Amino acid sequence: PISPIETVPVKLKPGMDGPKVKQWPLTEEKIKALVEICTEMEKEGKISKIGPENPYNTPVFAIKKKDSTKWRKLVDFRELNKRTQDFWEVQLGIPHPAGLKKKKSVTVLDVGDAYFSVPLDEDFRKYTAFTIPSINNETPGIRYQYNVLPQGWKGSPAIFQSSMTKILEPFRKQNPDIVIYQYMDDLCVGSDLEIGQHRTKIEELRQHLLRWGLTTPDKKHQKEPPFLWMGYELHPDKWTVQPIVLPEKDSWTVNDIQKLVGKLNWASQIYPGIKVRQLCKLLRGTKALTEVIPLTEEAELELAENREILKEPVHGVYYDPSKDLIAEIQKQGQGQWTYQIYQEPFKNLKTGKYARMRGAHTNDVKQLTEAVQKITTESIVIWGKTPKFKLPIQKETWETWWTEYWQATWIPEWEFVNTPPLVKLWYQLEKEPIVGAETFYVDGAANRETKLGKAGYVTNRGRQKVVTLTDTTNQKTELQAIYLALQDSGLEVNIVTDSQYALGIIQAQPDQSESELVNQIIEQLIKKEKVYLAWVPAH
Amino acid sequence: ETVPVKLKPGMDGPKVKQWPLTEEKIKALVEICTEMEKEGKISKIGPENPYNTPVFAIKKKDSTKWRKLVDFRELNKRTQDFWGIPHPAGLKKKKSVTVLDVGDAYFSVPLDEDFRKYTAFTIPSINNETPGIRYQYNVLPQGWKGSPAIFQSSMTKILEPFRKQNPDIVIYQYMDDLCVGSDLEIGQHRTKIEELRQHLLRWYELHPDKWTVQPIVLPEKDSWTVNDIQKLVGKLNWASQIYPGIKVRQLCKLLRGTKALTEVIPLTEEAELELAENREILKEPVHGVYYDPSKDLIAEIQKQGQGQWTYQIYQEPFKNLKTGKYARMRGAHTNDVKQLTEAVQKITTESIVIWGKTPKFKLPIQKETWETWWTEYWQATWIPEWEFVNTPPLVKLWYQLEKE
Ligand SMILES: Cc1ccnc2c1NC(=O)c1cccnc1N2C1CC1
């Protein structure tokens, strides 16, 4: 077919040379094959049989696919590629159902060998030259080169696209009420017209493209709704989730339990209640992939439980610009959050959860805020707007924390919602020393080399204690001094320390960490009715 | 015609990813962009141009119309040097300085044909249902350093008539901006600016005198508790990193023992003095602090809370070229980010006003958080460089100490 298309000016990376690789010799069966095809393409205007005036070459292979078992060629550009200049990023940001505006009707157009339809920068082809061997290194084979965007070449995806774009500018402006999407070879075209009007419009587009050389596939290959898009069945009224099969065997290898759990984790984003704690558990200390691990009862149970959930239909609605955008968030567990964005109650546009964001040390409100922003960024991309928030937290809780935290933070417009568990402040150090409460003067000391230390305090009330800690860091002790303190005090304590680390706990009053220690202290802190932390320089 | 400009030796063009935008913002850039396209200021580009810069919209000043902002920060950094206008020191001493937006000058002059690729910017499409709209500049870009450079001769050439019609008024130029400083009382001043506008047209209210640094003031009390002192001493201890003359020896003894935190302590005349001796040292900025032009300028910030934010501008640890505070702006009452970007712009303008360059910021906010929303409140035509930090629990307690 080819085209009357303005080619794109392509160049080789900064000061390099085109690929110079020797043609892997082949069988007579693969040759007679390759020669066959290269005759067709040759005449389809795609490739040009050039002469020995070309030092550049690429390896032409020959495989048999299923759809025919007829010989199919293959050129290895791994080299032309790495020597090919760089292009701007080929749309790696792909559409998401939840962001599609529902349409009266939507066509999907296979743009066929769109690739081989676009001309190549003539001032470039040479680098595409490859050679059809002779019967096992005989005389000279047959030399060729491409005239069009080659399959497997680095810039083809990018160049093809741009072309299509320039070509769509017109038809598109000629009827601003028809939305079109380009990707791979899929030209999905929709609009809010009448099937006829619609049908008649596609035909206008197809002919238009055709006016350039872009031939669009049969009535045969023609795709029929719904459409599969990364595990999604899409009808232009709503979308269903392309069901996922959970294989059942009596022999599970590591490799499997992973592939398995893998898919499961992805299924958590849509299905409510999918857990894998026990399944992940089966990977502990495995010695190899093919290793067959027996499923525990737990593993068999949750695994069996999940089977049902997936055996449930989770449909979907499309994006209606005329309706609000709402996002609701739940705290499935500490650090674990789930969200669902919808315009109409129960008609969810999108859902998802974020694997527990464990960290060095944060608090819920913090974490919530992060979930909030992760969502927001998502939203912008999907709908070009941020949603209204329904958050499991009281405005008072929010004001108190935020209006006082050492870090710039914020949550776009929201509304409280009482979908317990609610997120709250497990505790709040006193703004001032407690009058009455006992006062502990703690101190922790250890040899960092011997890792041996002591820890303790001495209250104003005469109380006192100390402990021998074998194998420890100086920190652990200090904090341990602090720990004991909270253990041995009443429900109101005044504690002073020179540990600059506690000073951190003051400024951020975190409610979760990594070290059981801190953790323990938190559990303690949470328990008291009033705690006043005080730091003072050491020595 | 055009002037040959290149990139710093071995530097390659910027390839920054365009951050996601709002719909309303996109519609705007599109409008805007098609416009300049027609005016020939910019032309769409193929895919063979791999460079790219971030773009975004502003709602600067009273206007339902948006301004277009491009982030040439990386481009600027990579662009060759040109040796700009020296510093009019005195500018900072005027009773009132004003600023103007003259990025509109640039569009006039043509940009060298061979540098344009490097100016490639891209407008996104929601949910990516369309490849971005690739463009690249033909004329001088607003926000690119070379711009005010190239347009220097033609710039000065149009200011003199004013610089001489009024020699009691100082005029400083930075990027797209311009700063006017006169001691005339408001009206005469403001009115006078317009005279310049009319001027410049034929082709910020700052008062820097009541400005700069302020001191630290220690607390005082009829009676002092163990804690009051503890804090007191803790702070003085740190302070000795700026002022070695400071001492807490006596005070520390007063601490010997282990009484209730709330117990009142009688101060020894020694401590009594030593405290006076420290109130004295702190009464003034540390000596021998001079700005080094060959060094990077730094600006740090701490979130005091209650809409409060202290900052410091220095080049060397503990040697503040300036320190200050900033209170939130009416109508930001529940938006940390607004105030922060709000503060930043202000500290940057002071930096430009005082030293004529932009500081490097250390921000008490999360990268994600900042990046997600700064643009929503940005108003300057320029953009400082920034890094995000975890506030030392003391640098704050220390500055939360300044006098008001
Ligand atoms: C896979 C895909 C990617 C991007 N957009 C669409 C589609 N496919 C659809 O079936 C679809 C469904 C609903 C709305 N728009 C849709 N279309 C647009 C063309 C009307």
Curated annotation (Swiss-Prot), chain B:
Reported effect, residue 152 to L: Confers resistance to pyrophosphate analog PFA
Record note on what altering residue 62 to G does: Confers multi-NRTI resistance
Reported effect, residue 70 to L: Confers resistance to HBY 097
UniProt effect for mutating residue 62 to A: Confers resistance to zidovudine
Consequence of substituting residue 201 to W: Confers resistance to zidovudine
Impact reported for residue 172 to C: Confers multi-NNRTI resistance
Impact noted for substituting residue 208 to L: Confers resistance to atevirdine and delavirdine
Name of protein: p51 RT
Native source species: Human immunodeficiency virus type 1 group M subtype B (isolate HXB2)
Lineage: Viruses, Riboviria, Pararnavirae, Artverviricota, Revtraviricetes
Gene behind this protein: gag-pol
Stretch of the intact protein here: 593 to 1019 of 1435
